[PDB]
Design a protein around this ligand. Structure first.
Ligand SMILES: Nc1nc2c(ncn2[C@@H]2O[C@H](COP(=O)(O)OP(=O)(O)O)[C@@H](O)[C@H]2O)c(=O)[nH]1
Ligand SMILES: [Cl-]
Length: 292
């Protein structure tokens, strides 16, 4: 009989894709079908629409694991019993789903994934953060075996030809008196990054939500660039521009993570040759990690 693992996540794409890689791994390991359920995504206005096909091409199989990733989540009844055991409660008992319950489920799923024996539950529902609960091969398999929609890929390609080709790009991811120090730290990270050697002429690719950070970093360093800014359509367009930056960061020669705890730059950490960041354990000090 067919048995399932459901990967639910509705936050930023880095978290959604790392978490999916943990769902996928358990499905691989126990001979289950993997269901990608992105209903309720922060990027899609309508609440019951599965967001995965809005940004990615259809996928029916990942490295041997069958995959359901479309609006079939709205017609199929996935069978119980369920794990975690909360998912066996009546639906009126499931309206209340506080953070304490989500975090318990992360911990329960983590225990299950470390256990030797498969669960007897016919459907595993993953609806908590599962970052760091899989191998790096799992993560790499997800990114290699799903594909961005043509419309998003064309923009990545255009930008790549316009700014990346023929050059070595230092990528800078900046999330967010406090603004004075932060600006200063970013500048010192960029000077460190620029002191290294590269094969091709250098340009600086800046990914930030602040117009003021763009403008100032642009005035303090040559050859800085960013992706231009262009209801439900602003949902989609926010998702798309998030993916465009996430994927371009992973084509840089060096990437600065401010901060390093962001899942947004996880893909870049996996592929890019050099990562620069603030060592939180020794705060205020810059460290450089060479990729294997
Ligand atoms: N377009 C774009 N989106 C980003 C960038 N960095 C982060 N984001 C997204 O904007 C939000 C940033 O995370 P944050 O506001 O700290 O809260 P979070 O949901 O816990 O990650 C998440 O949706 C990120 O995936 C970026 O450089 N460009
Ligand atoms: Cl890889």
């Amino acid at each position: 009989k067919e048995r399932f693992v459901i990967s639910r996540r509705r936050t930023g794409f880095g978290d959604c894709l790392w978490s999916l890689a943990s769902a996928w791994s358990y499905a691989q390991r126990t001979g289950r079908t993997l269901v990608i359920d992105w209903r309720g995504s922060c990027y899609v206005e309508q609440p019951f629409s599965n967001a995965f096909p809005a940004f990615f091409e259809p996928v029916e199989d990942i490295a041997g694991v069958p995959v359901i990733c479309d609006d079939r989540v709205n017609q199929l009844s996935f069978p119980g019993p369920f794990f975690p055991r909360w998912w066996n409660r009546p639906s009126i008992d499931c309206i209340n789903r506080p953070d304490e319950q989500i975090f318990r489920e992360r911990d329960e799923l983590t225990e299950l994934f470390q256990a030797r024996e498969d669960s007897e539950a016919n459907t595993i529902v993953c609806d908590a953060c599962l970052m760091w609960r899989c191998s790096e091969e799992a993560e790499r398999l997800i990114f290699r075996n799903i594909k961005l929609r043509s419309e998003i890929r064309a923009r990545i390609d255009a930008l790549y030809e316009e700014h990346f080709s023929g050059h070595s790009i230092i990528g800078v991811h900046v999330r967010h008196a406090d603004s004075e120090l932060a600006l200063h730290q970013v500048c010192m990270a960029i000077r460190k990054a620029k002191a290294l050697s590269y094969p091709k002429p250098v340009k600086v690719f800046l990914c930030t939500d602040s117009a003021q950070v763009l403008d100032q970093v642009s005035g303090l360093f040559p050859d800085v660039f960013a992706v231009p800014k262009r209801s439900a359509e602003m949902g989609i367009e926010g998702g798309a521009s998030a993916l465009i930056d996430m994927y371009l960061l992973a084509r840089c020669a060096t990437v600065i993570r401010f901060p390093p705890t962001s899942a947004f730059t996880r893909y870049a950490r996996l592929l890019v040759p050099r990562i620069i960041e603030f060592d939180l354990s020794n705060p205020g000090h810059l460290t450089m990690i060479d990729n294997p």
